[PDB]
């Protein structure tokens, strides 16, 4: 029953990323408006650039967290659908894949993983041959709504904004700057 909580976490991470985008855009447009002005508020421009950098780092962090939550939701949904499909067709899969399967029951770990990789390869050609027809694949019974709301893939913005990566030094400095900005906002 953890899939509903995972879906809620993905939703709130998406909301956080969207709101991050909103104040980033607001700060960006305000900074361009101030640049268009003729005022000599150079310190204002410098602190605006600092705000832009901090908000960009926050947006990148939120996008990364949302991507991680999306991957977790997809993984748990796949696992649950796998479990309630295998609880139905386990005997049939075992009958169709028997040799290595009762090889697993008494062979050593080397033979165990050799049989494991042989079976996974065999099913790899099985899937690549089956996908020739390529009919419209539908979702599951009760997880269809969750998979539709989450979507097949995350938004293009949430993945292209995460092209840049920060080493732990940049992560630490931007965390300190974000904490300072939070203190500034609180006061």
């Amino acid at each position: 029953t953890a899939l509903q909580q995972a879906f809620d976490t993905c939703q709130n991470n998406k909301a956080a990323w969207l709101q991050r985008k909103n104040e980033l855009a607001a700060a960006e447009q305000e900074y361009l408006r101030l640049l268009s002005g003729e005022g000599r508020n150079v310190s204002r421009l410098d602190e605006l650039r600092n705000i832009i950098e901090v908000r960009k780092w926050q947006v990148n962090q939120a996008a990364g967290r949302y991507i991680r939550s999306h991957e977790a939701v997809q993984h748990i949904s796949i696992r649950d659908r796998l479990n309630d499909f295998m609880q139905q067709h386990g005997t049939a899969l075992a009958a169709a894949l028997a040799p290595e399967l009762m090889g697993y029951s008494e062979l050593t770990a080397i033979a165990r993983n050799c049989a494991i990789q042989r079976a996974t390869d065999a099913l790899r050609e099985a899937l690549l041959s089956w996908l020739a027809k390529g009919e419209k694949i539908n979702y599951s019974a009760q997880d269809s709504d969750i998979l539709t709301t989450i979507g097949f893939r995350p938004d293009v913005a949430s993945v292209d904004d995460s092209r840049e990566k920060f080493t732990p030094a940049q992560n630490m400095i931007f965390s300190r700057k974000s904490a300072q900005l939070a203190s500034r906002q609180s006061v």
Binding site: R40, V42, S43, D46, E47, N50, Q180
Partner: protein
């Protein structure tokens, strides 16, 4: 009138205005004595007289008020301030005080402060409930203090080099070590001009010793 404007005026027109309205001889004594005499006569006339400056508390809790124009000399025009006013309006050392002042009478020889109209550029009652400087917790420099004028001046090069050399921000504790004949004074000139141009809101002070 307000003694600040007459103090800022050079000595020539001060002398001519002293002489043109009932004075005997003002040329051959100091500017402080000239100001004291004209203030005394104008107060004897009866009109309101205004003053402002920085308060100094002596070793006995006794108050003078100096002017920044005269570089805080102990001139005769410094404003008398009794300890009673210090304890009643509850000031500090170094506050900026502006208000009506009183002509001196027998027994004293500095102008007394009648009432206060502004302390540190806000309402006098708002000054009492203020937080101490030492109680403040320090931090590091956060807001960048850019040293580039941006007008593309020929000498602005020097200031530009500063932006490439060191970072200066609000609250920064800076040192400029240099042997003689190295351009320290005009480097300070450039810094002061950059502060006055780029950041006209922050208070700028330039202190010189000997």
């Amino acid at each position: 009138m307000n003694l600040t404007e007459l103090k800022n005026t050079p000595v020539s027109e001060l002398i001519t205005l002293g002489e043109n309205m009932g004075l005997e001889n003002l040329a051959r004594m100091r500017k402080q004595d000239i100001i004291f005499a004209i203030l005394k006569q104008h107060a004897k006339s009866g009109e309101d007289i205004f003053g402002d400056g920085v308060l100094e508390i002596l070793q006995d809790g006794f108050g003078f008020l100096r002017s920044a124009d005269s570089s805080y000399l102990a001139g005769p025009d410094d404003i008398y301030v009794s300890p009673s006013q210090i304890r009643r309006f509850n000031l500090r050392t170094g506050d900026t005080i502006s208000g009506k002042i009183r002509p001196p009478k027998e027994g004293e020889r500095y102008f007394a402060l009648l009432k206060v109209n502004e302390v540190n550029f806000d309402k006098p009652e708002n000054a009492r409930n203020k937080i101490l400087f030492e109680n403040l917790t320090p931090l590091h420099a956060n807001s960048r203090l850019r040293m580039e004028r941006g007008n593309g001046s020929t000498e602005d090069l020097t200031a530009r080099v500063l932006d490439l050399a060191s970072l200066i921000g609000r609250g920064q504790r800076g040192l400029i070590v240099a042997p003689p004949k190295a351009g320290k004074t005009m480097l300070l000139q450039n810094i002061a001009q950059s502060i006055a141009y780029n950041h006209p809101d922050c208070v700028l002070m330039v202190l010189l010793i000997d």
